[PDB]
Amino acid sequence: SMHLICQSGDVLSARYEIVDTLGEGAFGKVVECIDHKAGGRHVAVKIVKNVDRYCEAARSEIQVLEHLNTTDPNSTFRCVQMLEWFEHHGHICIVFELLGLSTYDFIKENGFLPFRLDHIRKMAYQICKSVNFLHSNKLTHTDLKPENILFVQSDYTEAYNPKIKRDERTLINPDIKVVDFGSATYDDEHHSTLVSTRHYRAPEVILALGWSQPCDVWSIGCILIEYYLGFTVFPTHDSKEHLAMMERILGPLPKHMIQKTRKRKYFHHDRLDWDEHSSAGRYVSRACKPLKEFMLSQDVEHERLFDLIQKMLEYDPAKRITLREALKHPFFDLLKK
Ligand SMILES: Nc1ncnc2c1c(I)cn2[C@@H]1O[C@H](CO)[C@@H](O)[C@H]1O
């Protein structure tokens, strides 16, 4: 059991002393450690469950990272640096540079308040650039979400905010890196139709129409909205409900995608088989609404962000904006000189 080897004070590989837990996922956990063979430098160690599927994903992640960290040794494109890996009591352990809080945890610890728009702009730009780098190297991440975007330094300043009537944390440096390459898939590898359920899943994934780089762009759209609102606009883990939410926010799915899907169960006469008047249906109607109605201001920068988000949430992955195009969107003009 992981609990036997992941506690504060334990030593891994005769080297890494566990300080505390940084975070957890399906795979196991990530712990901060003091590296006694590198002068006491603190690092992050990802301790992977001794379970086939996660061992496999960990081996894949290692191969992806060897490739990315070799192609981009200075982390210009902001993928986390893997320092090494080892085994410990049958657990794969991957050692990474220590980063700050995930963008998820920062939001959580700031009372679910959104990020300020200028930070959203910088972070969005970096995410697009980082993931575009992956896209340039024939990779799709597939598991982009706020937990997998981390601040390089999550240090903040804190003031009372009269407008919200609560104390607010403001981030000092919004620079990020992307983590978790355990699902990342190369173009020449099999893109399994089977993908497991998230808030950040693209419609082509849910409908098993095949996926590739565009599914990442969808996820990034979901992320940006969450950064803007402080909460997710797809809070479900049921697929059909997810599709009903999409329809409420973005309009009906394209007929041609509905026609092509193997997932006939969701539909009836090429319309989503969804009772709006069920208790779940009434929840979807009242919680979800057309995308633009989530805007907190009509100011032009808000309108620019939402225009980009809308393009990232194009249903048809063949028509969805690419990250290469996203990087030229007007929302990013303020970052250029
Ligand atoms: N290198 C790192 N430095 C600091 N924290 C890290 C990492 C990595 I790799 C992951 N995490 C934390 O663990 C959570 C699940 O991966 C993430 O969501 C995050 O909270």
Swiss-Prot record:
Interacts with PPIG and UBL5. Signal peptide: none annotated. Its EC number is 2.7.12.1. The gene is CLK1. Its main location: nucleus. GO terms for molecular function: ATP binding; non-membrane spanning protein tyrosine kinase activity; protein serine kinase activity; protein serine/threonine kinase activity; protein serine/threonine/tyrosine kinase activity; protein tyrosine kinase activity. The keyword Nucleus applies. Regulates splicing of its own pre-mRNA according to its kinase activity; increased expression of the catalytically active form influences splicing to generate the catalytically inactive splicing variant lacking the kinase domain. Leucettine L41 inhibits its kinase activity and affects the regulation of alternative splicing mediated by phosphorylation of SR proteins. It catalyses: L-seryl-[protein] + ATP = O-phospho-L-seryl-[protein] + ADP + H(+); L-threonyl-[protein] + ATP = O-phospho-L-threonyl-[protein] + ADP + H(+); L-tyrosyl-[protein] + ATP = O-phospho-L-tyrosyl-[protein] + ADP + H(+). The active site is at residue 143. The lineage of its organism: Eukaryota, Metazoa, Chordata, Craniata, Vertebrata. Residues 16-332 form the Protein kinase domain. Endothelial cells. One of its GO terms (biological process) is regulation of RNA splicing. One of its GO terms (cellular component) is nucleus. It comes from the Eukaryota. Keywords: ATP-binding, Kinase, Nucleotide-binding, Nucleus, Phosphoprotein, Serine/threonine-protein kinase, Transferase, Tyrosine-protein kinase. ATP binds at residues 22-30, 46. This is Dual specificity protein kinase CLK1. It is found in: Nucleus. Autophosphorylates on all three types of residues. Dual specificity kinase acting on both serine/threonine and tyrosine-containing substrates. Phosphorylates serine- and arginine-rich (SR) proteins of the spliceosomal complex and may be a constituent of a network of regulatory mechanisms that enable SR proteins to control RNA splicing. Phosphorylates: SRSF1, SRSF3 and PTPN1. Regulates the alternative splicing of tissue factor (F3) pre-mRNA in endothelial cells. Belongs to the protein kinase superfamily. CMGC Ser/Thr protein kinase family. Lammer subfamily.
